[PDB]
Amino acid sequence: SILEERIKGVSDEANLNETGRVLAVGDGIARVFGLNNIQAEELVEFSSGVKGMALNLEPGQV
Amino acid sequence: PPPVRLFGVEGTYATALYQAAAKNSSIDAAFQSLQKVESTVKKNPKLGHLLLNPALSLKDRNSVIDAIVETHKNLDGYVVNLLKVLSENNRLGCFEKIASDFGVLNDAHNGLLKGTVTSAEPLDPKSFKRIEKALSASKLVGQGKSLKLENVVKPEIKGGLIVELGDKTVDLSISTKIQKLNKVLED
Amino acid sequence: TPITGKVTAVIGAIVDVHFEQSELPAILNALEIKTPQGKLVLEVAQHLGENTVRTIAMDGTEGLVRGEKVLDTGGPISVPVGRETLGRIINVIGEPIDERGPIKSKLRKPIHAD
């Protein structure tokens, strides 16, 4: 109720299918969480205008 | 220390909790409340799916706990201190893992065994009782170690049944008998 | 900067900081950890995530108490240069260790460049 309302409020609210948010990064290599529907060997455009191809798809983290 | 070891595997949480809450003698309360807050948390779809998901941060997780402690209060504050610990440890997917384990420890302290009558069909009430009786009659279910016997229906097993409890099983199923019969008539 | 942190670990001269905000440095940004050894200048090299970087320490490490405040000084540090770099022997910081005293800045340039 009040629990559910506050739960709705504190939820991230990002679909993360076809997009995903970075969570590690260093060495010109990164690991992002999201991108659930993503093609393999695809080119992914980082919002800092970097492009990176994707070689590891791991559950949840590309 | 715990009367039984589950050899950790996030049972280390359960163990620690168990002895702490055992001396606080508030394990039944904890377990029930833990179940109860879990049922309505799980039935909050965001953070009943995403709670499992590790999308959440450290900081975002802490804010999840604050929502969780709005969902119920009290009923062992050691499991409330556990919620904080689990958010901090950033594991909240193997939260129900710990819940299951804690239940086993709790009911182990109570001295209760859980058995199963995996079967391919839901059996007679006569069968249920007779097996429950049989298990108590055997030393396999010793005294003070109670029995919850749950017959389950599994399609994978084709006919017959396997009774399991005490890590000793007697499998008088047709599927297994058929396996050996088939094999020798193909060899 | 409101990008402040504490030093979670000091494993060798590869310190780890835990910033207390979700405003983070970037890779090849620079941090000044205020210590009784003066400032120590470190360079963020990895983000190990959850606002915990792993930083190469470009000034020597020892006697560091865990949980020591950090401040983010950003980018690759910019030394002070001129033709007054000529006739100066400089330490890593860029300070004349032939001790003619501070270099007259003209252009100060980031240590990492493309």
UniProtKB/Swiss-Prot annotation, chain A:
Q: Where are the Phosphoserine residues found in this chain?
A: 11
Q: Where in the cell is it found?
A: Mitochondrion inner membrane
Other comment: Present with 41500 molecules/cell in log phase SD medium.
Q: Which residues of the full protein are shown?
A: 47 to 108 of 545
By sequence similarity, the record places it as follows: Belongs to the ATPase alpha/beta chains family.
What species is this protein from? Saccharomyces cerevisiae (strain ATCC 204508 / S288c)
* Annotated protein name in UniProt: ATP synthase subunit alpha, mitochondrial
Q: What is its quaternary makeup?
A: F-type ATPases have 2 components, CF(1) - the catalytic core - and CF(0) - the membrane proton channel. CF(1) has five subunits: alpha(3), beta(3), gamma(1), delta(1), epsilon(1). CF(0) has three main subunits: a, b and c.
Q: Which gene encodes it?
A: ATP1
Would you say which domain of life the source belongs to? Eukaryota
Its annotated function is as follows: Mitochondrial membrane ATP synthase (F(1)F(0) ATP synthase or Complex V) produces ATP from ADP in the presence of a proton gradient across the membrane which is generated by electron transport complexes of the respiratory chain. F-type ATPases consist of two structural domains, F(1) - containing the extramembraneous catalytic core, and F(0) - containing the membrane proton channel, linked together by a central stalk and a peripheral stalk. During catalysis, ATP synthesis in the catalytic domain of F(1) is coupled via a rotary mechanism of the central stalk subunits to proton translocation.
Coiled coil start-end: none
UniProtKB/Swiss-Prot annotation, chain B:
Q: InterPro entries this protein is in?
A: ATP_synth_OSCP/delta_N_sf, ATPase_OSCP/d_CS, ATPase_OSCP/dsu
Task: Say where the protein is mainly found.
Answer: mitochondrion
Pfam family, any one:
OSCP
Name the Gene Ontology molecular function terms of this record: proton-transporting ATP synthase activity, rotational mechanism
Question: Could you give the subunit structure recorded for this chain?
Answer: F-type ATPases have 2 components, CF(1) - the catalytic core - and CF(0) - the membrane proton channel. CF(1) has five subunits: alpha(3), beta(3), gamma(1), delta(1), epsilon(1). CF(0) has three main subunits: a, b and c.
The job of this chain, per UniProt, is described as: Mitochondrial membrane ATP synthase (F(1)F(0) ATP synthase or Complex V) produces ATP from ADP in the presence of a proton gradient across the membrane which is generated by electron transport complexes of the respiratory chain. F-type ATPases consist of two structural domains, F(1) - containing the extramembraneous catalytic core and F(0) - containing the membrane proton channel, linked together by a central stalk and a peripheral stalk. During catalysis, ATP synthesis in the catalytic domain of F(1) is coupled via a rotary mechanism of the central stalk subunits to proton translocation.
Q: What name does this protein carry?
A: ATP synthase subunit 5, mitochondrial
| Species whose genome carries this gene | Saccharomyces cerevisiae (strain ATCC 204508 / S288c) (Baker's yeast)
The gene from which this protein is expressed is: ATP5
Swiss-Prot record, chain C:
Q: Which residues carry this modification: Phosphothreonine?
A: 73
Oligomeric state and partners? F-type ATPases have 2 components, CF(1) - the catalytic core - and CF(0) - the membrane proton channel. CF(1) has five subunits: alpha(3), beta(3), gamma(1), delta(1), epsilon(1). CF(0) has three main subunits: a, b and c.
Q: Which family does it belong to?
A: Belongs to the ATPase alpha/beta chains family.
State the protein's name: ATP synthase subunit beta, mitochondrial
Coiled-coil annotation reads: none
Q: Which organism is it from?
A: Saccharomyces cerevisiae (strain ATCC 204508 / S288c) (Baker's yeast)
What is the protein's known function?
Mitochondrial membrane ATP synthase (F(1)F(0) ATP synthase or Complex V) produces ATP from ADP in the presence of a proton gradient across the membrane which is generated by electron transport complexes of the respiratory chain. F-type ATPases consist of two structural domains, F(1) - containing the extramembraneous catalytic core, and F(0) - containing the membrane proton channel, linked together by a central stalk and a peripheral stalk. During catalysis, ATP synthesis in the catalytic domain of F(1) is coupled via a rotary mechanism of the central stalk subunits to proton translocation.
Other comment: Present with 164000 molecules/cell in log phase SD medium.
Q: Which residues of the full protein are shown?
A: 40 to 153 of 511
Q: Where in the cell is it found?
A: Mitochondrion; Mitochondrion inner membrane
